[PDB]
Symmetry: C3
Subunit: 236 residues, 3 copies
């Protein structure tokens, strides 16, 4: 055999990132709750609205916008999940606005832009902002003010094939949604086993501020808004 232990020194900013990551766990009391979403409806919608959508808006219709809009609706329903707890003053600051940070992928790494005031956006606007920030961040010119102060987060581990896992809360928030890969699985529809494209979804919430019942109902609201997008119009 052989032995060798070459090494590299940790730079300043990576050390800062590690310290911040540990502070995130040492500040919040994190727990996770899982659920499954039937992705048939979104796939069926996009597989026929993609062509006309591409012609109209010069954009590709992914399913990220549906999740972003559903999460925005769920947050609007339950303000507490949109709030954050500040220990420096012993105050639970609420927020009337809602902006969401979505992770984008670059060969150099992954970064998290922010979508400002998502409550007034359609699917087209969300997709356009996502594409604009994904091409703007592909080149390194992404400034701090486009990454600062998200209230809620959506993490994408699905594109790499994970089944389900526990994400970690980005410091200045109270929750994070972690999506995962879509897999064909057998499910029971109307008392009969059937094959559908399903995906597990995991939510991590700060148990100090958000009760377990609140987190579970919030996740079920996201599920309801993603399975049948027409729920968004009914304000149901």
């Amino acid at each position: 055999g052989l032995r060798s232990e070459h090494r590299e020194k940790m730079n300043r900013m990576r050390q800062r990132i590690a310290q911040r990551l540990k502070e995130a766990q040492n500040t919040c009391a994190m727990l996770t709750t899982f659920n499954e979403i039937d992705m048939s409806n979104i796939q069926e919608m996009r597989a026929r609205h993609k062509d006309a959508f591409l012609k109209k808006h010069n954009l590709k219709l992914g399913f990220m916008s549906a999740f972003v809009k559903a999460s925005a609706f769920a947050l609007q329903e339950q303000p507490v999940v949109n709030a954050v707890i500040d220990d420096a003053t012993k105050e639970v600051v609420y927020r009337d606005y809602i902006d969401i940070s979505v992770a984008v992928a670059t060969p150099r790494g992954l970064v998290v832009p922010v979508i400002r005031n998502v409550e007034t956006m359609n699917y087209a606007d969300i997709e356009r902002t996502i594409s604009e920030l994904g091409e703007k961040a592909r080149k390194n010119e992404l400034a701090i003010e486009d990454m600062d102060g998200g209230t809620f987060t959506i993490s994408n581990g699905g594109v790499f094939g994970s089944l389900f896992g526990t994400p970690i809360i980005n410091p200045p928030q109270s929750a994070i949604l972690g999506m995962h890969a879509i897999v064909d699985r057998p499910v029971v529809i109307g008392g009969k086993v059937e094959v559908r494209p399903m995906m597990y979804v995991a939510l991590t919430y700060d148990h100090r501020l958000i009760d377990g019942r609140e987190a579970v109902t919030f996740l079920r609201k996201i599920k309801a808004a993603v399975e049948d997008p027409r729920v968004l119009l009914l304000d149901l």
Copy 2:
């Protein structure tokens, strides 16, 4: 868009609750292990003993009592899981008695009464105590001595539709059982795919005191006692 950050100050007791919650994680070394329970037998039992049980005892036959009794049996089998570790004296205090705290739901919130000395109770007694405490706590007159000093806990996230998640240990204990919603899922019975009502069950245990093998065997014991209630009579 618009921005507004109205806020509310955290009261004394909620701050104390948050501090206690963080102390719970900073004291124990928590891990989780999951399993699945086939709920066919309990449903079939209650769907035909409900009427005569209601006439005899003036009570509704839920499946909470079955889980409470099965957990009591499992705890009696493995004393270590019923013990707690005291850092203030460096002693692992065992307990010959067994009392279990079960979470009840109220519109104002959720609270956790205690069932004293569950080892000598039938299903009828457990159901009667649960109903009595659920109606007594519906009105606010629930005193401290009815909530102090549980050795083991059963958490109910199922009624809200969660699939599975990781609960957090109530401070003065070594484990907690978290039930979840019952869903019809395809399973393999005798080499053939079949549809049954299943439910995921999660156990969180303090890894300092309880070994992984012990936790897994304890969870399997609960599964065995809940799938086939006649195991309780055999002392098997």
Copy 3:
């Protein structure tokens, strides 16, 4: 009812173990990601190569060696997962060698020997080392130098029937693989529901050093190497 709280004092070494266990969580930023592995191929291989393998090597062909070799291949593919982070000097020490610690079961308890330089071993060598250490540790004569300094770990909760759970990183490492019990489950093969022997696999990684994408790809690499062992020969 009755009450009694006899107790036993925690000895020195068990207290040290608990302190080390808590230090493990307070040092690393741990997260978990899960996946499922189709175990048909390994079962089919061993169910017909077992007899000739037993005659040739006087050994029983388990599936532990396949997992050990697949994990070694995955580690060799991604050096960062094999590295560890040292806070005492602010350096990320890499390792050109690879040794793996595998948990063995004894009636007195469970212990974790080490397999040195697994990158140059076949299935036969890994099985022989596992058997030798399992019989050597059955008797208490297992020295420290046979347990010190593993770079990666494989934990066995399957033999006790667990479905899936979150293991805890052994201090001087950056990841741990936790296997679980094999269960027959319905899966979709070529658009049609089918019954196969499956098993959930969980990876716990230190989020300070290993990115989520890296962990997910590493787990998928293990899955690819275990489902089709011929991937090992192709260096694919």
